[PDB]
Amino acid sequence: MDPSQYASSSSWTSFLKSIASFNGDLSSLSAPPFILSPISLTEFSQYWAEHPELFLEPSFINDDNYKEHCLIDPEVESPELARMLAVTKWFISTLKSQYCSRNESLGSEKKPLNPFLGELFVGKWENKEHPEFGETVLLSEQVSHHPPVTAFSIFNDKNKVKLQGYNQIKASFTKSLMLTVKQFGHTMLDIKDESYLVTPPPLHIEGILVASPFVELEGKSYIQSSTGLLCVIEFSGRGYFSGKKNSFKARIYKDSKDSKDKEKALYTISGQWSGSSKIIKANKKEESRLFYDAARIPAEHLNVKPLEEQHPLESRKAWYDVAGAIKLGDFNLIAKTKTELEETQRELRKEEEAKGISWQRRWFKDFDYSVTPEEGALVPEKDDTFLKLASALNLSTKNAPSGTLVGDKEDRKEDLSSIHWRFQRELWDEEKEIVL
Ligand SMILES: CC(C)[C@@H](C)/C=C/[C@@H](C)[C@H]1CC[C@H]2C3=CC=C4C[C@@H](O)CC[C@]4(C)[C@H]3CC[C@]12C
Ligand SMILES: [Pb+2]
Ligand SMILES: [Pb+2]
């Protein structure tokens, strides 16, 4: 049907009613075909680097050229600061990809496919027009199905720029039908020997009543560097304090201590992450410059091998029949194809449970950061990057919502685990079946 008839359709009304009794698992909602997306959540990991040049820019900044790599401030105080500005710009550039991609390609936000345990998604940005960039690889794996957890790593060996992280969400509906989403997990970006810890922000999906869902960010995201520098990004929008759609304000501080006082901000960036934003140095509100304009820089999609060459575990290959059914909008075919794949998975889980066998993750392992870790789990190294950056930020290392600080209510939750998924490069190095 036409989108204009979605909201009043029998299908949408039945969907809204299933919300009333939402059991906590999104996969239980009777989402009609027209609100379904043929894309699996394992693919969302690619949204961390759809602007190859911004992802790599920090690695080209050094003690001998940093002032030449800071468009908004040729008088930037240091290379460390120039790089934090670049990482901040890169982070902001990921937002449109992360949260607007479906509105553009599908017409609105839609329900993504719930990945099966073990699902893989791999590809690469060849960066053919920039030989100095080199190839950038994306590895994404569904390390958990119950609950859904996606782990990933994006790396550029030529320039020593590597990223790794994992993501999980916990969602619930408000009485007004707003879908509240708390993200869990974090992402670390290493630029040569310099590291950055990034925490995703909470968000909500509105437009549910009118059958035209869309994402709006809220809360805060942090970018803590080993240099001590810290960027605090606050999100707002319509219905909130600023009243300006997809807005944000980011402040960069010398360190987490300074972040307690907005007056100490070295730079203040403000605008819309899905559009343009300006930056101001210190208190010089007079002199402001364009920081980023999402509309001027097209996203660059990674190269994914053709379906015919994909391994059974690769997302698109495995979901092929279901994606096709969704594109056709065939009620029965969608249910049939989805059940076939999911029932097969269900049977695998039952065999494993009765046989005493467990699914082995391919390129990621779950490290236990608790003071009293599970006896068989891998544990972090004394010089662990996350530990030192979390300590500098005073960020909780528990499985609390992303961005939770030590002491917050979420960090004081009793018997809360501290398990984090980590990329194991050697596992990809000795990978014998999957190729790019
Ligand atoms: C009809 C409703 C139920 C549909 C539209 C909503 C589906 C939810 C589950 C979808 C819509 C937007 C999706 C979404 C968008 C962007 C990101 C950023 C990515 O880095 C992690 C996954 C995450 C956080 C996912 C999680 C699942 C979300 C929140
Ligand atoms: Pb709103
Ligand atoms: Pb384990």
DSSP 15-68: HHHHHHT--S-GGGS---GGGEEEEEGGGGGGGG-S-HHHHHGGGG--TTTGGG
CA of 398 to the centre of ligand 3 (A): 16
- Ligand 1 atom closest to the Cα of residue 167 is 21
Q: Burial level of 93, CB count in 10 A (0-12/13-18/19+)?
A: buried
Distance CA 424, CA 365 (A): 7
CA of 109 to the centre of ligand 2 (A): 15
Chain centroid, CA 247 distance in Å = 18
Spatial CB neighbours of 371, under 8 Å, sequence gap ≥ 6:
none
Domain count, the chain: 4
Same domain for 125 and 158, yes or no, is yes
State which of 169, 182, 204, 209 you would mutate to test the pocket of ligand 1, scoring each by most atoms of that ligand within 8 A of its C-beta.
Answer: 169
**Method by which the coordinates were obtained:** X-ray
CA of 34 to the centre of ligand 3 (A): 38
Binding-site members are 26-31, 98, 102, 111-114, 145-146, 338, 342, 346
* Residue after which a domain boundary falls, among 93, 118, 143: 118
* Residue after which a domain boundary falls, among 262, 278, 309: 309
Same domain for 357 and 273, yes or no, is no
Same domain for 347 and 422, yes or no, is yes
Same domain for 220 and 169, yes or no, is yes
CATH number of the CATH domain containing 107? 1.10.287.2720
* Residue after which a domain boundary falls, among 118, 140, 159: 118
Same domain for 378 and 402, yes or no, is yes
Is the CB of 35 inside a 6 Å radius of any atom of ligand 1?
yes
Same domain for 200 and 173, yes or no, is yes
87 neighbors 223 (Cβ within 8 angstroms): yes
Same domain for 205 and 187, yes or no, is yes
Same domain for 155 and 196, yes or no, is yes
Q: Give the 3-state secondary structure of 66-132.
A: HHHHCCCCCCCCCHHHHHHHHHHHHHHHHHHHHHHHHHHHHCCCCEEECCCCCCEEEEEECCCCCCC
CATH number of the CATH domain containing 361? 3.30.70.3490
Is the CB of 169 inside a 6 Å radius of any atom of ligand 1?
yes
Same domain for 426 and 326, yes or no, is yes
Distance CA 377, CA 372 (A): 11
Same domain for 27 and 98, yes or no, is no
- Ion ligand 3 residues within 5 Å by Cβ: 366
Same domain for 238 and 302, yes or no, is yes
Domain extent, residue 174, equals: 119-309
Resolution in A: 1.9
250 neighbors 233 (Cβ within 8 angstroms): yes
CATH number of the CATH domain containing 24? 6.10.250.1430
364 neighbors 423 (Cβ within 8 angstroms): yes
Same domain for 148 and 86, yes or no, is no
